[PDB]
Amino acid sequence: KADIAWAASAEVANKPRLVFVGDELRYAQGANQRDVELDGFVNYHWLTSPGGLGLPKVMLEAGINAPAEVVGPDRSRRALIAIRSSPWKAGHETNPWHDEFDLDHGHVRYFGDHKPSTVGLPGETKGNRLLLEAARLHAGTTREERLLAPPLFLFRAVTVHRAGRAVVKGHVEFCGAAIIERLEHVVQRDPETGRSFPNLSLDLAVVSGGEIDGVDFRWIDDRRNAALAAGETLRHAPESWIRWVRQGRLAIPGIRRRVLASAVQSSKEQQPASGSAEAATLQTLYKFYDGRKHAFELLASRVAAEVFRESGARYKEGWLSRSSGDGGVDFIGRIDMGSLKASTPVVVLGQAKCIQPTSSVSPEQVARVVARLRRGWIGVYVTTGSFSRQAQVEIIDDQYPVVLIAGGTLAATVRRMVQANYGGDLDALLASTVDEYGAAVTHRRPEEVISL
């Protein structure tokens, strides 16, 4: 009876049990601990506590959860804290005290479980007590305290579909492990009685799984192990959390989870391939348009036009704002979105800047264009050089409606315009943009492109 129960624990201790952010789990009431996948999804109780360990379940009810206080040769320890929130609304805001999940930037604001009927002060409820006691450890200035600091695992109630219909109850979503970076006392007004009650407000920093966005659940097996030390649990623990226990609060901005919407391109993958014809072509473009910026602005307008038409959308070229000097906007255009005789106008603000293909564009120069954009307006930045990482990061993060055109796209679109209606001769378009054509500035308001 001992050899078997031990060999099973060793068996589950050998195999890794990974979870990932977004993983739909099946949280069933009275579920076993053997079924690896219940009802199509990975079973919760098995993932958190396999049957091989011989350990009881880690309940995940609405609010704050925690298993028994782990007593050990190390010290008294809290294994972990399991958090669960809802999304179904039935109110006015619905809540001024609603839990906010910013997983893309690794930050979650979560509110305590103090009820208006709770007789006492935060936190007489088990949940808030666990939260305070853990907060004291997360605010630890030593490794001896941060080792004891129980990991807060996040879960989110999700609606899961199958073949037909949608199941709202019975499923959860792993959101990650987090550090308690701030705790506050708040006052929430219960609308049922119109009476104010106190509560807790946690600012949490979600740590990123290295190298892939996930967590090995054997770490929890380590935490729950009453025969282990606090330092003996950092074997299957993510490197970020380890770096937190090793460093402190100063490691937070470096280990905090970070997810962008779209991909970011380096200067090398924005510029054409080294040695290719497009490289020498871009160099000749930088050499030719170094003296005159305006012809480069006209070129940029035409290029932008061909780029917007490349997708399929109907584009209408407007004009060029300036004839001398510099400004925030260099050229104006318009995009008719939809079908013919029903399409809606979208003003296209354009900025062009000729620069070394090795050089990159600063985010403030892009922002000088973004700032002029009103509702229903989009932008386009045309350059010979590349775009800095922070530029694209700020664009993606803040959801900036700006089309980026670096060396590569410029070279390709121009090369397509050299073959289409230029007849191979590039100096034809190059010189045509220099004289005659460059005199047309129109000099009108940007929103007046709609009228024509």
Place this chain on the structure above:
Amino acid sequence: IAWAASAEVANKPRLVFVGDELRYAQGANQRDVELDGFVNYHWLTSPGGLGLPKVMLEAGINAPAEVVGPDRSRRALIAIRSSPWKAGHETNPWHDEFDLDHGHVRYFGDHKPSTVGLPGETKGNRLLLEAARLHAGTTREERLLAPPLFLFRAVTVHRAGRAVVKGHVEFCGAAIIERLEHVVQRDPETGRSFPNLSLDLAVVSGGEIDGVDFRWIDDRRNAALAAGETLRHAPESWIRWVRQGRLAIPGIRRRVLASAVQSSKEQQPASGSAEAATLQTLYKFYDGRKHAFELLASRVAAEVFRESGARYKEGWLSRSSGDGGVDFIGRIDMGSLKASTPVVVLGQAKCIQPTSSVSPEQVARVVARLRRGWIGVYVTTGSFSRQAQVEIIDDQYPVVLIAGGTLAATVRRMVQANYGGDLDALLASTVDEYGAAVTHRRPEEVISL
């Protein structure tokens, strides 16, 4: 040819469209029409042969001599000339404000820091006061004498082939003085403050033609003609003003929309079309099925956006809000492949009788939700009210409109061009095979997937 030439001038209409670029040269001929690729200004104001000198148009306020008639004396007209622009450096808070699309222009008088005394000691402002007194109105006989104000702005042009900066102007309609004020301006050169005049002006609607018949000027410069005899080549707007007064101003001002307003008939399918029948069946089906009609709306809007080559990608709905109306979310990839930028598409739907129209506020509920980088789309079985379209165009609301006509048209080719069946399966699809696809996600998350 003495009076016969002047009578020959009174036969040929000299219509001057609002926006016509004119050639203004120092010592320009009054006989030659076209000058340097442009219509000569001096000939336009004074054709020569009328026995009348050319109406000068120097910087700011101009006016010809007083006109002596058979009864009473009248001022012919007032010729204004401005000059934009400062090449990306608008400097004056006392700059003239031109809103021709709504027939409104605010113009500032020509008092100068050097000018001693109060406005208008200066000739221009003096003329402005004198005219404004008549523009006040009260009686129709008093409005009858009020001199029209013709507006011009110096526009940099292109002489046949290459650009020319100075020596060219641009017509800007005829205006009524609706407000006179005294303002104080600080001269940047000196730093000291000087008084001046500020004028709110209503540019009247031309009527059949946006421009005006310049023979009106000739009639007003005609000494033999009386005041009430000068209103024959004048726009009906000005006549309505002389009749009524300051009350007729809202209904006579120039009104220009960037686009055209469609009627209910053209927003609906042809009266005898099969698509009209399918539309009627659509309405009869989704009368009490809002959610299904909204999923359908998501699909239809998706196919409409797709029917252009534009890289469109669908998403979800939003029936979670909290007693809030349902809206579908989509996303468009803007520009070429790789060189692309996401755009969130927020759409709403309303199944109404094909005869019924959508109010401006209902569309505005979609417009309001739009953050920068978003576009809206409204889908309905009925039509769209005039005022809604007006507000969308005028205020430049980025919202795509799909009436019953476009709806039925796109739906008709959305089934028997891919389904391999009929409309019934789709009507059942939006109910059963669609179900709940709203989720609890913000519209911004569609660009993150």
Place this chain on the structure above:
Amino acid sequence: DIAWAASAEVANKPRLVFVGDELRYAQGANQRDVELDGFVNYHWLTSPGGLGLPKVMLEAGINAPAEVVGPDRSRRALIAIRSSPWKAGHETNPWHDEFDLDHGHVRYFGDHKPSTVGLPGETKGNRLLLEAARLHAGTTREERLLAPPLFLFRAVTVHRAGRAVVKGHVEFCGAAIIERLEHVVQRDPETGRSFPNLSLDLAVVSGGEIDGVDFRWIDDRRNAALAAGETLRHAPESWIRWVRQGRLAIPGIRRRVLASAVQSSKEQQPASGSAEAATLQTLYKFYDGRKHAFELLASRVAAEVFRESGARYKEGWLSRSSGDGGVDFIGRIDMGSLKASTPVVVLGQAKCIQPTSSVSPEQVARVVARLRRGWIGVYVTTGSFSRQAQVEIIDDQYPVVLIAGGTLAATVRRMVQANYGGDLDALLASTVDEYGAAVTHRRPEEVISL
């Protein structure tokens, strides 16, 4: 030394009271009983018998114990204030105390009476308020240490044994710092007298870990053997922070209660039979036919509402003299330094509907849609705003100020009582005769030139 046991008990036992606590207030009650008639004894909580100190009287208005003489200075321990809001719609006085405890803001008026001779304030209350204001704006931490905390109390109607009972009970509303004190001129609707008085903006500080205070703070402040710097050991963290930093602490120490900003139709409308209700009736019955005169009135009302804060508001124009459209009127709010400030274009919409009717989210959205970047909106109505409209304004974060029946009626009451001497019909006539003249056809952006 024998009573020093009870005194030590008092000094050692934390005596907490929370914002919203119901206290039994009886003048003849003793300071030894902790409970009286079902509720906590006010006089015990404020001045326990173990201290042997006199009672802290809570007369209606402004109260303060005799000056406390310390080894260093002579300080006023505290200033107890008892307001009496009483009514759901309000009383008859246009200048009544209003509470925004969910945001730690209280508009409170001085005790200057119509029958008061001289300048504000020859009355003891206003005098105490000014003497307190001398310290609440202390130029040093030492001065701020002497500053008497304002303890707000507020008469209420508790639900006891005999099917609820009015009077005899007060409500603790927190400890306050005087943000602002200005000269105001009020008018008694009944007597007809116009008199000066003091208008005070008060900041109810955040309690921190608890939503209230420890009255041992008051015990320390009343202790004549303690220096002012020795009395902060039981004071709120927000208060200590204020004493240290001064005015720089106020924006971050106000009490905040996370509560639904959505209001019902009953809250937005006056009481069933209040003065504001009759005012609203006169307004609706008057402006039922003509919408433009009401647009003018709404312009004035929006102006007053924005000017309450002390903001730099400048009127613009009225859009249309006939017909209907998206925006009814235009104004502006200069924000920043007097030398270099940025203007905020204000877009207004007026709609006179049945006071029982509500404004739809689409009707609000017609206004919100017109808002450019840097622009703010305002919607004025005789009716209310639907729940969903407010929900969408909160959700999608619409920069729009909502002025419904109650706010309109109250504001109009103040305007009438302070400019036309209680003559509503004069104001109405002025709106009818002057609306046509206050109309321009300018773009909203042109308001910056004003």
Place this chain on the structure above:
Amino acid sequence: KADIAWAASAEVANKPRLVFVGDELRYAQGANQRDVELDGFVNYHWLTSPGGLGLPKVMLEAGINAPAEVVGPDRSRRALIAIRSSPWKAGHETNPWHDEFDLDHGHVRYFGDHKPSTVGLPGETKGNRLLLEAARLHAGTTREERLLAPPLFLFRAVTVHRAGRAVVKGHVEFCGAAIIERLEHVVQRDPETGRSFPNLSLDLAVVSGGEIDGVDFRWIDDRRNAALAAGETLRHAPESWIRWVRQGRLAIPGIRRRVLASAVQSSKEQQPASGSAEAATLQTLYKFYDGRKHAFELLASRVAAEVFRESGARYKEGWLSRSSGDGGVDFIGRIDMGSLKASTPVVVLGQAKCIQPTSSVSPEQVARVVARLRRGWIGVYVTTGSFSRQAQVEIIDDQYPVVLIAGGTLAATVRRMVQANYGGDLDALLASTVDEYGAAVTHRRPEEVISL
């Protein structure tokens, strides 16, 4: 005898004495009331009280002045109140609570005559008593009370030079007629003696002259005319004033004097004048925050707060976006626009930039802040330097809702903050920003400031 006198008074009553805003008047206490021109300038005493009237002088001593109560048949009334503002330091102000003139916007911030050694509440002094008795009528509840209201005529001591020789004393200038828009309690501290004292602060609304940029002094003659009733004294009053008498509070935001002037300031104008105490303060600021970025961000948060408080808006302290590194947004606040009952939250984005006081902020740097602004949001840029002219014109043209705080504004605001809270001790403030910039940093989204 009687013929000449009565004809003199009649000829004064039938002749408009127009005085414009900015006019320089010769003021001699021993001058006569006959000469209309004294020492190359207009005689003050003649202008304010012509000899033909036979009325006593309207003395203009330093501070607040008022003639004897006019015993009219309607009742007793005050003719007017003549304010004289002592200084123009041209930037060399040492007292933070000096009177501020903004005549281009018809606003004047004025301060009472309460002295540090004054015993009693404001105002036991004659001046403050005059201002309070006046304010009683300026906020008159009826048209008649407003008819009784004595107009405030503002005068500022000026240095004149008509021959090429500057004369510091002896001459004053007209600054229009004003309405007491606001009268509030305030506490000042004389930096000299170091003594703090209470006083009155006033927001004055200089009214629009209408057709003329000034007033006709026959209005004053009529108010001083004891034979005239109060209602009969408006015959030569400005239209704005009559409109105020009729309407009341509702007229004020529409009758303020307005002067159209360029909002663009030079680098010299955005900086405190050289040789001033304020310039020394700015020097100390730049020198102290030359290496500190985030401390300067905290300080900038505080300063922004104070400026918004000056505007009258209710500001709410939010947080700092980061404790380390750089970014677009440094600090976040909130403004509850409207009244207590009816209001809306306005998110405030802030950016700090401790550059050289001679260095100017580029359009791209400002636009990096503007680009982050949604609707219902406002921005604010705080710098030790100035803003480039191009940045300013880009702000004005596209109407960017951003508050500009350059070196001068910053320094002045800091001087007032220090004098009013730390007893003139700047080190306390600086150390406060250095020691508290770490615990003010949160990783929340700017929209979360509505919950604070």
